[PDB]
RNA sequence: CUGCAUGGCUGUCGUCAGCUCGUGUUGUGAAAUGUUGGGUUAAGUCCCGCAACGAGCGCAACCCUUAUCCUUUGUUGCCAG
RNA sequence: AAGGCGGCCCCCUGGACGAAGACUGACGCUCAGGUGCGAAAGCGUGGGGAGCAAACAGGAUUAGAUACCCUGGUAGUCCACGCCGUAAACGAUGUCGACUUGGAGGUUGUGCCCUUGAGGCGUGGCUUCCGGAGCUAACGCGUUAAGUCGACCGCCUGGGGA
RNA sequence: GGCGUAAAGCGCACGCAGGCGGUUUGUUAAGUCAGAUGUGAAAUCCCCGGGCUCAACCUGGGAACUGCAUCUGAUACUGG
């Protein structure tokens, strides 16, 4: 029912008296393809357990985005610690023009045509954070008309 | 419930104006003795509203979990909880009761098993060793979660006393999506609570009236 | 640190011996070595017959060997020529006559010898050690074992540097002498060297 | 020949009291919490308190021997009447 | 204004703040180049020299000890008038203006209330410590912002070489 | 795009040139905006077509050349 993507697997370490202890971290995203997205981060001593933890984490932790038949409503900007993200709707037939970490998020979101660009840090975790936060702050025209209390043509 | 029982129970008395929280400026009538005075005409309709939705939750067969662990108010809460066929938390709130239900349900399984062997098992195989420990550990289990032993699953509403002393349970309920009903004293913040009721919380008569009225209204919830 | 052999430390407490004969120091060494020869045989000709334990017992002047097995049909064979073709040669090796009995192990997934043999047989078939280990553990734990832990060691996956990798599950109190601990060892001879496998299975106390 | 390709076995820190995990929670993250705090113990031993709740390998017990008594049997061992 | 300023008295003199009014009527803010002020050490000329003390000498310590420690000790430290123009000259945070939840203090004015005390209720200036939103890579900052904004100026563009 | 700690706030101030300018009314029309006219060579780029068996290539018409000058209007904002 939901599409799942594995974005990053990293090996991290922690020193003890005996020596170094290695662990694996997995960052994944899951979506339904019609405007629901979640990201998940997992850690484990072994990789498949880490990936399963991240998928379990991301089946919860899922937000809604209001799409316009496969593309955004307007140009959006998202920001997290080091990552700045600019996304912009495109015409039919452009495809997802985005970086490696944005591409999975926008693919499993159900978006089909955007032009995106990453500035600053392209650390995958923060880039996924910023893309999610820039998608969630994007508003549909009917909610703008509800805000302003007037449902004029511009819908 | 109306205005004058709430005055003479001392619902209007706040904490000192040193320890106030800004977010509850709207529910503050004034100050005397450098003591906040809680606004009472604000308390009455939102209390009634909380009571109404508690009733409706009650008759759709909702499980309600009273929370109060103050030494001076928790016996009133056991009183009110089993007077109205509901559940209570009177001793220390285990961090993770709701978000980590999968793990604490083994604690309640342990509690149930060693109580069925307690005296309708009637083993009294003593070992030289195990009265002193098995009995004391049943005590340790039932004083902290003996009020939750019959819940089975996640509750349907949180009734809170003194939201600041009970921030862990409130944030747990906010993550899990359970409604929170809290008496909000002048020093606590109301943003985790979805049904705010400003009143006094340190006096035992305010608490008595609160849970008397709520126990009543859920008893006539289960009445339907 | 180095551990005590968990079967040896429990001999006479909860675990019995694999040989139950008496002898003076006159015939002790030859009894012992002819037992070694019979055991070496009943190891190496019943290789793929899943034998777990060989109990040798010597009444007055003759032997009886009890073979614990998971697959009794192959060591009892087609109407029973095969225990004949075994005792005719075990009486040959031990010089005295012989008798053979065959006991069945009904759950071959709760015996450390069979589980070790399984994991080494898979390791010699070029299978990823992780899958062997985890399947052994989950099969042993889904049949009522109170605990298990497996450990493989030595050039895993053809690496140049040998490693020791172990997987535990349940409860294995090796310091409790009451503990029913079934332990065994096996070795897989691959194209990169020997790989050692150890298996502990805990079934209960007393 | 290569223990610097390995299995098995052994020494060592050290019989030192420690070493971790699941779920939850906190942090963008490496990670943290639990395992810290007040007492106590030979001991992460135990009790209180506590965003933690539980579990595993260790500690302790279960094993052998020595120190007291009782019952049974009585030679090849014993000698009170 | 910054550098800085500490017995008491007198003379000359700059700024700040408050009360209630009166007056002028945008006369304002910032500022490249320019000008002025600018710790300590140092330099020039002339005085002064108690204490302290670079250099220097001796005694120790040490493998050595051009040091740390001890006994001495000159320039200098002090005054007048010139020069120098640099400091971790730091809040490592340019100036000016507006806006945005709180708490506890210090100091200096002023208004009102039985001034009944070393009482209570207000309203200005300057200042210290916590901390909310927000911001930040984090640490932290947080109405005296590193928050939200405007005007002008200075500066940065990998580490060495420098 | 930055300048508390990563490179980066002059040691501090005064101040000329320069940049910037509270509020109201009137006036002007310099900035600004609208329209028109002249010009912005052809070729090149782009659109719609046409010819070489297709393509490259060649070619018809348009669009564009974001600019400048002049004339006529607008007066909210900036300037006088
Ligand atoms: K070795
Ligand atoms: K954990
Ligand atoms: K003065
Ligand atoms: K200058
Ligand atoms: K001196
Ligand atoms: K030396
Ligand atoms: K001198
Ligand atoms: K300073
Ligand atoms: K941090
Ligand atoms: K400047
Ligand atoms: K260079
Ligand atoms: Mg530790
Ligand atoms: Mg800790
Ligand atoms: Mg323990
Ligand atoms: Mg604890
Ligand atoms: Mg000087
Ligand atoms: Mg001089
Ligand atoms: Mg001189
Ligand atoms: Mg000296
Ligand atoms: Mg000199
Ligand atoms: Mg001078
Ligand atoms: Mg300098
Ligand atoms: Mg200074
Ligand atoms: Mg500087
Ligand atoms: Mg500042
Ligand atoms: Mg100035
Ligand atoms: Mg602060
Ligand atoms: Mg360079
Ligand atoms: Mg930069
Ligand atoms: Mg530095
Ligand atoms: Mg710097
Ligand atoms: Mg400065
Ligand atoms: Mg300078
Ligand atoms: Mg100027
Ligand atoms: Mg000027
Ligand atoms: Mg103006
Ligand atoms: Mg001007
Ligand atoms: Mg004009
Ligand atoms: Mg054609
Ligand atoms: Mg004008």
Swiss-Prot record, chain A:
InterPro entries: Ribosomal_Su5_D2-typ_SF (IPR020568), Ribosomal_uS5 (IPR000851), Ribosomal_uS5_bac-type (IPR005712), Ribosomal_uS5_C (IPR005324), Ribosomal_uS5_N (IPR013810), Ribosomal_uS5_N_CS (IPR018192), Ribsml_uS5_D2-typ_fold_subgr (IPR014721). The keyword Cell division does not apply. Changing residue 103 to S: In strain: NEA-319; neamycin resistant. One of its GO terms (biological process) is response to antibiotic. It comes from the Bacteria. Pfam families: Ribosomal_S5, Ribosomal_S5_C. GO terms for molecular function: rRNA binding; structural constituent of ribosome. SUPFAM superfamilies: dsRNA-binding domain-like (SSF54768), Ribosomal protein S5 domain 2-like (SSF54211). Keywords: Acetylation, Antibiotic resistance, Ribonucleoprotein, Ribosomal protein, RNA-binding, rRNA-binding. Changing residue 103 to G: In strain: NEA-314; neamycin resistant. GO terms for cellular component: cytoplasm; cytosol; cytosolic small ribosomal subunit. Gene3D superfamilies: 3.30.160.20, 3.30.230.10. The keyword Thylakoid does not apply. Residues 2-65 form the S5 DRBM domain. Transmembrane segments: none annotated. Altered uS5 proteins have been identified in a number of mutants. Some mutations in uS5 have been shown to increase translational error frequencies. Some mutants in this protein can partially suppress an alanyl-tRNA synthetase mutant. Belongs to the universal ribosomal protein uS5 family. With uS4 and uS12 plays an important role in translational accuracy. Many suppressors of streptomycin-dependent mutants of protein uS12 are found in this protein, some but not all of which decrease translational accuracy (ram, ribosomal ambiguity mutations). Located at the back of the 30S subunit body where it stabilizes the conformation of the head with respect to the body. The N-terminal domain interacts with the head of the 30S subunit; the C-terminal domain interacts with the body and contacts protein uS4. The interaction surface between uS4 and uS5 is involved in control of translational fidelity. PANTHER family: MITOCHONDRIAL RIBOSOMAL PROTEIN S5. This is Small ribosomal subunit protein uS5. The gene is rpsE.
UniProtKB/Swiss-Prot annotation, chain B:
Keywords: Ribonucleoprotein, Ribosomal protein. The keyword Signal does not apply. The modification N6-succinyllysine is found at residue 112. CDD domains: RPS2 (cd01425). One of its GO terms (cellular component) is cytoplasm. Belongs to the universal ribosomal protein uS2 family. Required for ribosomal protein bS1 (rpsA) to bind to the 30S subunit. This is Small ribosomal subunit protein uS2. It comes from Escherichia coli (strain K12).
Swiss-Prot record, chain C:
One of its GO terms (biological process) is cytoplasmic translation. It comes from the Bacteria. GO terms for cellular component: cytoplasm; cytosol; cytosolic small ribosomal subunit. Pfam families: KH_2 (PF07650), Ribosomal_S3_C (PF00189). Keywords: Ribonucleoprotein, Ribosomal protein, RNA-binding, rRNA-binding. Residues 38-106 form the KH type-2 domain. InterPro entries: KH_dom, KH_dom-like_a/b, KH_dom_type_2, KH_sf_prok-type, Ribosomal_S3_C_sf, Ribosomal_uS3_bac-typ, Ribosomal_uS3_C, Ribosomal_uS3_CS. Signal peptide: none annotated. One of its GO terms (molecular function) is rRNA binding. Binds the lower part of the 30S subunit head. Binds mRNA in the 70S ribosome, positioning it for translation. Part of the 30S ribosomal subunit. Forms a tight complex with proteins uS10 and uS14. With proteins uS4 and uS5 encircles the mRNA as it enters the ribosome, which may play a role in mRNA helicase processivity. Some nascent polypeptide chains are able to cross-link to this protein in situ. In collided ribosomes contacts ribosome rescue factor SmrB. NCBIfam families: rpsC_bact. HAMAP family: Ribosomal_uS3_B. Belongs to the universal ribosomal protein uS3 family. This is Small ribosomal subunit protein uS3. It comes from Escherichia coli (strain K12).
